[PDB]
Paper text:
As a proof of concept, we used this platform to identify both known and novel L- and D-amino acid peptide binders to the well-characterized model target, streptavidin. All peptides bind within or near the biotin binding pocket of streptavidin formed by two surface loops [1/2 (amino acids 22–28) and 3/4 (amino acids 42–52)], and by antiparallel β-sheets involved in an extensive polar interaction network, in which residues Ser88 and Thr90 of β-strand 6 play a major role. The surface loops of streptavidin are flexible: upon biotin binding they undergo a conformational change to form a closed conformation, but to accommodate the peptide ligands, loop 3/4 is dislocated by 13–16 Å from the biotin closed form to adopt a well-defined peptide-specific structure. All eight L- and D-peptides discovered in this work bind to the same pocket of streptavidin in distinctive binding modes suggesting (1) the rich malleability of L- and D-peptides and (2) the ability of streptavidin itself to adjust the flexible loop to accommodate multiple peptides with diverse sequences and conformations.
Further, we screened cyclic peptides with L- and D- amino acids to discover a 5-mer cyclic peptide that binds to streptavidin. To identify cyclic peptide binders to streptavidin, Cy5-SA was bound to an array library of 388,962 5-mer L/D-peptides. The pentameric peptides were composed of a 4-mer peptide synthesized with a combination of uncharged L- and D-amino acids and a γ-Glu: this residue enabled synthesis of both head-to-tail cyclic and linear peptides, respectively, for each peptide through either allyl ester or t-butyl ester C-terminal protection (see Materials and Methods for amino acid composition and cyclization protocol). The cyclic peptide with the highest fluorescence signal intensity was NQpW[γ-Glu], while the comparable linear peptide showed no measurable fluorescence signal intensity on the array. As the array data would predict, the linear version, NH2-NQpWQ-COOH, exhibited no measurable binding at peptide concentrations of ≤2 mM. The peptide adopts a flat disc conformation with all amino acid side chains (except Gln5) localized in the same plane. Asn1 and Gln5 engage in polar interactions with Thr90 and Ser88, respectively. Further, the backbone carbonyl oxygen of Asn1 is hydrogen-bonded to Ser27 and Tyr43.
Residue numbers in the entry:
A (entry chain C), B (entry chain N), C (entry chain F), D (entry chain E): 1 to 5
E (entry chain M): 16 to 135
F (entry chain A), G (entry chain D): 15 to 136
H (entry chain B): 14 to 136
The structure:
Amino acid sequence: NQXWQ
Amino acid sequence: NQXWQ
Amino acid sequence: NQXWQ
Amino acid sequence: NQXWQ
Amino acid sequence: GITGTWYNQLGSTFIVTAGADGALTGTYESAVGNAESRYVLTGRYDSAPATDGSGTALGWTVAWKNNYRNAHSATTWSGQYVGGAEARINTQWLLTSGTTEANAWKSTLVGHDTFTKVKP
Amino acid sequence: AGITGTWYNQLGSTFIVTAGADGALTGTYESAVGNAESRYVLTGRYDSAPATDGSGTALGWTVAWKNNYRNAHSATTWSGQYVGGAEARINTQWLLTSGTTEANAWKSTLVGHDTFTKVKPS
Amino acid sequence: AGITGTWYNQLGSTFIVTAGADGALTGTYESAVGNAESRYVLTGRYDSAPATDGSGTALGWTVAWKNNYRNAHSATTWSGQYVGGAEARINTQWLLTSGTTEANAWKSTLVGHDTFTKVKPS
Amino acid sequence: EAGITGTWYNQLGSTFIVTAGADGALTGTYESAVGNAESRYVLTGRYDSAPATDGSGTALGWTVAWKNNYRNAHSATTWSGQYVGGAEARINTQWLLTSGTTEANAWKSTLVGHDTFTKVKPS
């Protein structure tokens, strides 16, 4: 959601 | 999920 | 949470 | 829940 | 693999195709036997999972509208596929209803479903 | 006005979606605005014939966290409703599941909530 | 400063809590501010030795929706963290489970989120 | 409440002992791992002390903050669920585990899951 998610 | 959902 | 919950 | 939780 | 016909603990049927591009496409039937309870589903899955014994992450959505019924709601299942002798899809889900602002605090139900390819 | 458009949250993410006549949602989720390496496919569904009394339009979508550069072996589903008016919003709750071993499956899933608008934060 | 005190959300609810030295939370949750018929016991736990780097203090509490006047055969648990600073906040996610038959258990639990502050809404 | 009061087991190896008081209180101890006193934590919660008699379950919830005299995981779990009633003694729950985090990591502060507990230890 943030970064790699 | 059940019935109409 | 609201009302009776 | 498991371990330290 | 993920492609196939799956059944949850309550008897609902999930027919899915896992595409090479990470797509999930199919139909979800809330009650066995009637076309009136069949809905479109679309989702995504990890097409290159870890090779260390971990499950394969996936998710999909069903909006509860078809040519017969409209429940003004949608469910998303988030989970992982676990391969083996008794392959399983373990999920948690969120069912959000369209509400007015006064009722938005109680718009969403949460639950969990486990699917297998074994017909009840 | 409508679901179709470019949406932002207050944590630096954005998504671009198209709401098709058949109830489909298709688009892209960019976890860090302006960083093209953080773009992932988004697919979902929405209620194409919602109620008329001011009730929101139910919807949901999924992003599997794999693109051609990065794979976090996980997927997030957002479940929510689109609300119209002067400043349209999409209010959601989400579940982020990671692929794990059976021993670690109890802690495989994060839960949270996000609200999106079409206005980019200043 | 601290968890002990009177808290409010933006949907007209309030609660009074004491965070005991032993990690206990005790208090009363009032569903509708100024309506004494909407007061219920709250009990929970919190981390009495949290991290010092600005991380929140983990906590949780339960209210069973039965008092001397009303019984909604249900209970909500709030799980979250207390964050200090100029305007302290308690950020939570909650689960509201109702007593149901096994056939209706799939729809027994609502999920949501609430943020509380000590500032009474105007 | 004789139904809820007792020792409960989950399939994951955790156990808890609880007393359901006449005033709606749940008090007890949660043990995350078998025979390890360093894995024992205080549990407190509430339950509906006058449930429906129509075959519905009894609503309940409890919290465990993951601090004891030996360990501190700076986190707390709340279980929300119902005591099923009927021949098999079972409590079905969903839970939220929130960790204390900085603002930057608050978006990923909470895990969600589900646990089922029985008075007869699973095989």
